[PDB]
Amino acid sequence: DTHKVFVNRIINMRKIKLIGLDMDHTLIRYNSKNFESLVYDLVKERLAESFHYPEEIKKFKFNFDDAIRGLVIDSKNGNILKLSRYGAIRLSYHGTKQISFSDQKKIYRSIYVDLGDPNYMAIDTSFSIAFCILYGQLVDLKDTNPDKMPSYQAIAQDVQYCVDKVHSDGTLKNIIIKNLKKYVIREKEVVEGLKHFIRYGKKIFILTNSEYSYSKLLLDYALSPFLDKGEHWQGLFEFVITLANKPRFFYDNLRFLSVNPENGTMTNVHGPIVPGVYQGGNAKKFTEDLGVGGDEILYIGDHIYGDILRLKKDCNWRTALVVEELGEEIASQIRALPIEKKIGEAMAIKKELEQKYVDLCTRSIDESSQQYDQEIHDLQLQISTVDLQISRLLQEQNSFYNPKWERVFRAGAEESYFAYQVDRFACIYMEKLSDLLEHSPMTYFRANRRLLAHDIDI
Amino acid sequence: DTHKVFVNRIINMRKIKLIGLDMDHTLIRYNSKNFESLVYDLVKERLAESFHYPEEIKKFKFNFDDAIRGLVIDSKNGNILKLSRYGAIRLSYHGTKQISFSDQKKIYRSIYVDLGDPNYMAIDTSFSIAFCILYGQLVDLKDTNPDKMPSYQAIAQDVQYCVDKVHSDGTLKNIIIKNLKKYVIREKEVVEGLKHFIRYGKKIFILTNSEYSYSKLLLDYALSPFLDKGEHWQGLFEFVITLANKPRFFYDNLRFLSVNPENGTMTNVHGPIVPGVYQGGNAKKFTEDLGVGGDEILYIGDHIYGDILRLKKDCNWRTALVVEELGEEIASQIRALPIEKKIGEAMAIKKELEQKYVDLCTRSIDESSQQYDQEIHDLQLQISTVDLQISRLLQEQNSFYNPKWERVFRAGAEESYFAYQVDRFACIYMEKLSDLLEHSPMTYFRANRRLLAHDIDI
Amino acid sequence: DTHKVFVNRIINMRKIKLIGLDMDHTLIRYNSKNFESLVYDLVKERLAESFHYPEEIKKFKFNFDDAIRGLVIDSKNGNILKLSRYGAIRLSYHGTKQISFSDQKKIYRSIYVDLGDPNYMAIDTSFSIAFCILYGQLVDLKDTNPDKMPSYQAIAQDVQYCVDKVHSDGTLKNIIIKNLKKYVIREKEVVEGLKHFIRYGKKIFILTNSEYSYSKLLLDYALSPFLDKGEHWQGLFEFVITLANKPRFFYDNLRFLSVNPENGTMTNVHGPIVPGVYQGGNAKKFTEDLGVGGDEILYIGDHIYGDILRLKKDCNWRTALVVEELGEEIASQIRALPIEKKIGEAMAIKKELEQKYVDLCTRSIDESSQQYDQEIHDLQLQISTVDLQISRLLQEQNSFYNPKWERVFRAGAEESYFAYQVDRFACIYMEKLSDLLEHSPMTYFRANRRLLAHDIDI
Amino acid sequence: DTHKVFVNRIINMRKIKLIGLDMDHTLIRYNSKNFESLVYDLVKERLAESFHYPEEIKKFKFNFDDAIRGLVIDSKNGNILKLSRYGAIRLSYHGTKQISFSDQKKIYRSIYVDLGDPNYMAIDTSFSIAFCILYGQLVDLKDTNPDKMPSYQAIAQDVQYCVDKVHSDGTLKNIIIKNLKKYVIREKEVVEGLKHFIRYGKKIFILTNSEYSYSKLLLDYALSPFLDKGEHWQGLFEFVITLANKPRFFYDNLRFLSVNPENGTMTNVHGPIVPGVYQGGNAKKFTEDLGVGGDEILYIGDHIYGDILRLKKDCNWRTALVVEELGEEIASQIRALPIEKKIGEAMAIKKELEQKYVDLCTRSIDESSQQYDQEIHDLQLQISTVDLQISRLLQEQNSFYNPKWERVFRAGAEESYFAYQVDRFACIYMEKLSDLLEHSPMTYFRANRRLLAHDIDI
């Protein structure tokens, strides 16, 4: 609404003794439109280079609006669909052309789907958008000459491989590191917030999925500029884990490696870790060595990037999420505020106009028998009129959001699959890290009561 | 709240052409306290009869309040626990003695659990309460002399077998059929409601898990009394499926059997079914033969009794649920209405009293440095006072609910696991079938908008 | 070899008190070539009738040799492949055109596959052959105009549905019942064998997946003719279960129904079953009521028709299998007996010719250094000659078996996936039921010792 | 038998361009009796130290014969059992006291088990024996005072944790490194064999799960002594991977780290790996960088140590296994050679003595009717006599093997679960690595034909 930190589960900032931050996308903000466009290009490129896809793909035009965050795709049928909170298909596309409610139903023999079925891709990653947009064009081309390109599920895997390789390959980090200004966006409020929480005995640490050599470059560029004379960015973090292999870092058991800030060389760890630079590791050992409880640790990330059930049951420490798209969602809803009120009132006028439609319709066969024959036919059109207006209003309201997929947190009336992932995974969430740091490091974040249908409100 | 039908998903009663009713517990109401007590006795009996459990169990006193609906038990550790909407253990018991947050955490190595792990029993059945209460006493005895009784998971299976046998055995149906007055509770409103929906071209049908011979006895006793001269209860239902094997009836493919209302004898079906009595069957064939769409069929039951995912994805027709316990929940909340307001106001007084605690606490080290040393120590006690009151108030509020497990739909602040099952499984739910029939058979049930944390309310 | 009953696990016929027989294909033999051709036609027909597949399929010519028993198909890629004992792909086909070792490897990223992956169909049914042959042609047509036909996995499901419907539909049973002479093959030895085992206190019972009305027709035609005056076929069986729903009949819990031999009408069972006609049921209750142990019951079937693990762990009574194709396998091996000896000797001649190739090859660099340069080049061709002969011989040996898939029990040198299913599922197996009855009903079937590689033979 | 290398699947040593060796237990032999005893002690110790188990365990006497390789234990019931090739329980123990066939059957409701059920531990590790022996004593103590020790499955996990910690802790490696003579056993034949294969263009590499610092110590001690002047052990290996994290090393994607042989420090890899010391890694990248095919790589290990299906389907390169216990198995069978012949002949004498028992038994009711009443009663005792002898002989034969669990590769008549794991996982296997190196590095290992029951032998 009009706040900065949205709460899902209670969390006392006074009890938190350490805060973990995902360097990329959480601690260091990026230009979503550019970063995505870059990955899309690199991947679109590598495909026709190491997989020899048809050259036509080289001429694929990227459109950022072609996809929205939180979409799910099934590599089997080469489809992309917006799922509801319970897996119900709100709207689907095969490639780029929408699928009729009819064809969808006949295809999935149900309005629901089974995310347990690995044939679907429901993981929240920082490259979903690009992936979705590309995969869409990549299936259209496939439908044309299906003999030249692999199968729908094959393409999906290939794209995933490229997206993956380009990330560990070095291709991506290089293009950006040599353009820190087109891709990364800075803000002093972040360095100020960190300093604020530090002044409260709170120890900050970061865990990235990038090499130290590269991390030292981004951090320096994105932080140093805002420090005072004599200060160093490395004095902001008590710990910094590089090539953390984030997903598994939380629930796995991969070993740590002490990193020499100077050379960059490393040596195996033979005891409890201590303030400094490390590589790899796992949350279990980290929490242990620091002599604290998981509930005394809060980690903030940009994308779930994994299975919520295992992440929450196997890790044990508090988790928050920063959702960038939240900026546009809130903005669009505020913009549609007036249109919302209009459908609302138009609705009430249709509700009582219908409430009376039955009152005199039941009476027509509950006490009498044929008397209002023309009476009902009067409200029957008087309702088809107001309902026609509501149709148009709902249409205007759509113009305020992504025309192809509507809003991110909504799957029609109910919340979207992504809205559910956030609710389950993050106890707290906001548009950008800065919002959280803006508050008092000793704030007690409470949640608003849900209130069930059978509950009485006061 | 102050309504009869609670809505979870939109459903237009004008589009529904057929309504299915679960005979036992939905169409025919029972005395939960008695019916449960009976099953508990029969099962407690059969155990020491076919399994030779220690005679001590014969002296087990049944207490209806020892369990609440929607609990989950893990046969492995012989524990019973109240799970939240996302599997977090709100409170657990090993046998009958509560488990400390500490011991729970060390036992489950997490505050969450994996319902996918078959070692847990999370199915909503009409015998859960009794089962829970018995299983509890059955583990206490086990802990005493663990050499005489099977393992925790063994006991669980045994109990399930007895509960099952006693149901198909005939033991249960007989005790009740010979006491239709101690166990079953009647109400003319039901027969009136049925007649009402029938007068609107709506075809009602029922599917029970009992033999016809027995069904004809309950129906006659529970319905006939309220009909007019010349009327027969069999004229209320277009179809009646006996020994439907409910769970699988919806998603399986078991074949139908035409039943002769007179003899009770049967013959295989060799074509589309037609109005009358049948046995077994499956929803797929039933929907087909009637030439209608699944969405044009509404089935109302008393307990989910199965896996929600498969039931909803594999069946396809609308489903509502009647939750009896809802009567006491609403009643208790209304009773605690005044106490609720008190913690509420006591909270606001603690909120701003804390809001100012930081305002002058941060200032103590944000602009100054040691000046309000005694100032803060004044509000620190003034807050420990109001918080102490809130503690007592929350205590009084508990007295209004089941002392051992709190409310059914709540797992602390958030909804309970059962509240989630209802939300996902039923588009509509109410305390008793009668509530639904009280409305207009051409009612359009709409749901209230959820509203997310980041949503702005008008 | 030269025996009738092949043993996999020890079984004492003196301990067996009851023998169960699968009516179709086990007790009553059929003309595999015709029965398959019929199903193929019916299914090929229904598709273009209820699914509207392209009319071209109506002109599909059936070839019985296009498939062999025990093949596996993956509905995903529309492929059919012959798996080894451990899931290694011995040879694969996409539609009808073989796949190169190279393309196979790149497609499955391994020479093995995961039968746990439901995308594969590895169930041994009595319609696999036809299904395979049709599915092959059904994918070829698909590749031509992929826009008109469903997806590879869709087609597979459709075919399965038709194969299924045509079986419960009545279409199949009717064509045959009106041609018992073109489809069914009789033999008095069966009626004599039954009478023989009966004379030894052994109770025979049958469980079919067909209606009684139809069973009474086949049994009468296939048995009565061989009885003596005053005898009746119904006097051969102590029990006869109809519409047994075989697969689940063994491990499920479906209830029994007493069947009136005259009318055909039925009534629910309210106690232990007794000699006579029943419908449905489950092995658990059957074994119980008869007061015997599972190990005292032997069931003989024609196809595994299910999951071996569950069938063997959840059922508990002895199981044998009758494999019709065994007739041609043995026949072909005997026919290739002489060719086998030739590759064998040609092998020994290549073995020692190679044994000496290294002896003088290692010596060329183990004690000396370049001396037999031309010496080795002499045996190098003398080996490429004998190896060329062996190549041709192996070629001649193939002509003795199915040219497209080789033998049923072999996947190259090692046994085939099907050979493994038989080994695990049946303790005893033979070409036809008659073979078993030919032996003494009090025979003790022993198995030959396996003998491991590191074992010393005497 | 009388050979050194036992073959399961064909493998041409001429095609193999690289051979991987597991350093511990494969390349460097150990004193199984001592190494196990050590682990048992360390683990028995750590338990009462970090888990505070009852001090009584400190007095537990280790017995090496209490367990045999290839056993399976189910943490749930705290049982240890010897499974057959298909999961059938040949013999089980709850703690230390055997379980009757009767109690076993009632406990597992079947003679089979489901290894897919994670409640079982079926992984072949180098610490199974010790683990089994300890776990047994650890459940006996539990049964005494079940209130002091965790649950059966808890204990199992604890033991696994200690076994694991003690391995990564350093506790184990230290005790041994300071006693390389009590634990490790050397043999020059190994260094000679390596040199032999190297002289044939074959590149050897090793991958251990230990740190380099420690590896350099064992290798030097176990190899250097056998080299010629000027030679170094590091000249025997083209590659050496340390802390390979073996299990996942084959199918995972963990990254490599170049290791500085001198300092021991490391640096991330930014290109194809090259001859030298590395840490971590994965088979996929390794095979790629070397520009060879998986089938051109052979890895020899001491224990499967993982899931065979994933290891074989996800890795792709050839695998052999060295089974130490094979030394005693072969030895014992040779020792029982004469006793074997005796039961064999005693069997034949019982076979024909039974063959004639039926011949004159059937005749007693196949042509006559009561005539040999006393005749049969003569052979009935003459058979109970020879069968009594066979009973004693089988008894003498057992004395030649582990009295508690019989042989490792046998589960009664058929092969054991472990025999199956070897057959499926290793294409080749032998008692010790040395055996393989004794052969010509350009040997073509062929397998003996299996031969099915219905096969005719020449």
| CATH number for the domain that contains residue D365 | 1.20.58.1160
How far is residue C287's CA from residue C289's CA, in Å, rounded to a whole number?
Answer: 6
D172, D113: one domain: yes
Our CA angle for C277, C283, C288, nearest 5°, is: 90
Domain hosting B386: range is 325-401
The amino acid sitting at C366 is: D
Q: C271 with C238: CB under 8 angstroms?
A: no
Q: How many domains does chain A fold into?
A: 3
The answer to whether D151 faces chain B, any CB pair under 8 Å, is yes
Interface of C with B in 349-408 (CB under 8 A): none
Residues of chain C contacting residue B255, judged by C-beta atoms under 8 Å apart: 168, 243
How far is residue B383's CA from residue B394's CA, in Å, rounded to a whole number?
Answer: 16
How far is residue A377's CA from residue A327's CA, in Å, rounded to a whole number?
Answer: 47
Take residue A289 and report the two structure tokens written for it: 């060595």
Q: Is position B453 within any domain?
A: no
User: Given a contact as 3+ CB pairs under 8 Å, which chains touch C?
Assistant: A, B, D
Our CA angle for B155, B160, B165, nearest 5°, is: 125
Residue C396: other Cβ atoms inside 10 A = 13
D97-98/C318-322 β-pairing = unpaired
Q: Is C228 annotated among the ligand-binding residues?
A: no
- Report the residue from D6, D87, D454 with minimal CB separation from C453: D6
The answer to whether C161 faces chain A, any CB pair under 8 Å, is no
CA nearest to C237, candidates C253, C216, C266 = C216
Q: Is position B306 within any domain?
A: yes
How far is residue D293's CA from residue D316's CA, in Å, rounded to a whole number?
Answer: 9
User: Long-range contacts of range D141-148, CB-CB < 8 Å, 24 or more positions apart?
Assistant: D141/D53, D141/D54, D141/D56, D141/D57, D142/D78, D142/D95, D143/D95, D145/D54, D146/B146, D148/D54
A6-7/A120-121 β-pairing = unpaired
- Give start and end residues of each alpha helix (H) in B308-425: 308-315, 326-335, 337-362, 373-398, 417-425
Residues of chain C contacting residue A151, judged by C-beta atoms under 8 Å apart: 77
Q: Do C268 and B170 touch (CB under 8 A)?
A: no
B282, B145: one domain: no
How far is residue B114's CA from residue D118's CA, in Å, rounded to a whole number?
Answer: 14
User: Searching chain D, which residue's CA lies closest to the CA of residue A248?
Assistant: D254
DSSP helix, strand, coil percent of chain D (3-state; round to 5):
45, 15, 35
Burial class (CB in 10 A: 0-12, 13-18, 19+), D34: middle
**What experimental approach yielded this model?**
X-ray
What would you measure as the largest C-alpha separation in chain D, in angstroms? 94
Interface of D with A in 327-356 (CB under 8 A): none
CA nearest to C232, candidates C278, C186, C191 = C191
Q: Is position B458 within any domain?
A: no
The answer to whether C151 faces chain A, any CB pair under 8 Å, is yes
Q: A208 with A22: CB under 8 angstroms?
A: yes
Q: Is position A458 within any domain?
A: no
Q: Do D330 and C454 touch (CB under 8 A)?
A: yes
CA nearest to D447, candidates C100, C382, C415, C349 = C415
Which residues have CB under 8 Å from D406's CB, separation 6+?
D68, D82, D90, D91, D398, D412
User: Searching chain D, which residue's CA lies closest to the CA of residue C314?
Assistant: D110
Polymer length of chain C? 458
Take residue D177 and report the two structure tokens written for it: 């490194």
How big is the B-D interface in CB pairs under 8 Å?
Answer: 6
C66, C213: one domain: no
C169, C57: one domain: yes
Q: In Å, how far are C456, D90, D325, D344, D439 from D330, measured between CA atoms?
A: 9, 21, 9, 19, 20
Polymer length of chain A? 458
Take residue A221 and report the two structure tokens written for it: 């560029």
Residues of chain B contacting residue C255, judged by C-beta atoms under 8 Å apart: 168, 243
Resolution (A): 2.9
- Report the residue from D337, D362, D409 with minimal CB separation from C452: D409
B276-280/B256-259 β-pairing = antiparallel
The amino acid sitting at B439 is: H
C188, C283: one domain: yes
Q: Is position A106 within any domain?
A: yes
Q: Is position C373 within any domain?
A: yes
What is the secondary structure of C122-155 as a DSSP string? Answer: ----TTHHHHHHHHHHHHHHHHHSTTTS--HHHH
How far is residue B398's CA from residue B392's CA, in Å, rounded to a whole number?
Answer: 10
Q: Do D424 and C10 touch (CB under 8 A)?
A: no
Q: Do B255 and C243 touch (CB under 8 A)?
A: yes
Take residue C294 and report the two structure tokens written for it: 């599972």
User: Searching chain D, which residue's CA lies closest to the CA of residue A210?
Assistant: D268
Strand order in the sheet with C120-121: C97-98, C89-94, C79-83, C72-74, C120-121
Which residues have CB under 8 Å from A84's CB, separation 6+?
A90, A411, A412, A414, A415, A416, A417
The tally of CA atoms less than 13 A away on the side-chain side of residue D178 is 7
B27 φ, ψ (degrees, to nearest 5): -75, -40
Residues of chain D contacting residue B103, judged by C-beta atoms under 8 Å apart: none
B312, B422: one domain: yes
Q: D71 with D161: CB under 8 angstroms?
A: no
CA nearest to B242, candidates B214, B284, B203, B273 = B214
The DSSP symbol for B146 reads: T
Take residue B337 and report the two structure tokens written for it: 């209405």
Residue D263, H or E segment: none
Chosen for mutation from B173, B265, B279 (greatest number of chain C CBs closer than 10 Å) is: B265
Which residues have CB under 8 Å from C399's CB, separation 6+?
none
B13, B49: one domain: no
User: Searching chain B, which residue's CA lies closest to the CA of residue A86?
Assistant: B424
Take residue B279 and report the two structure tokens written for it: 């046995």
How far is residue A408's CA from residue A401's CA, in Å, rounded to a whole number?
Answer: 9
Residues of chain C contacting residue A145, judged by C-beta atoms under 8 Å apart: none
What is the secondary structure of C288-354 as a DSSP string? Answer: HHTT--GGGEEEEESS--S-HHHHHHHH-SEEEEE-TTHHHHHHHHHHTHHHHHHHHHHHHHHHHHH
The amino acid sitting at C225 is: P
Q: Do D453 and C448 touch (CB under 8 A)?
A: yes
Q: Do D146 and B146 touch (CB under 8 A)?
A: yes
Q: A434 with B312: CB under 8 angstroms?
A: no
B64, B139: one domain: yes
Q: Is C24 annotated among the ligand-binding residues?
A: yes
Residue D23, H or E segment: none
B75, B20: one domain: no
Q: Do D76 and B77 touch (CB under 8 A)?
A: no
Q: Is position D93 within any domain?
A: yes
B97, B49: one domain: yes
Q: Is position A305 within any domain?
A: yes
B63, B146: one domain: yes
The answer to whether B151 faces chain D, any CB pair under 8 Å, is yes
- Report the residue from A7, A113, A442 with minimal CB separation from B453: A7
The residues facing B84 across adjacent strands are B416
How far is residue C38's CA from residue C175's CA, in Å, rounded to a whole number?
Answer: 9
A158, A50: one domain: yes
Our CA angle for B122, B139, B173, nearest 5°, is: 60
Q: Do B265 and C265 touch (CB under 8 A)?
A: yes
User: Given a contact as 3+ CB pairs under 8 Å, which chains touch D?
Assistant: A, B, C
Using the Cα atoms of residue C191, residue C193, residue C194 and residue C198 in order, give the sign of their dihedral.
positive
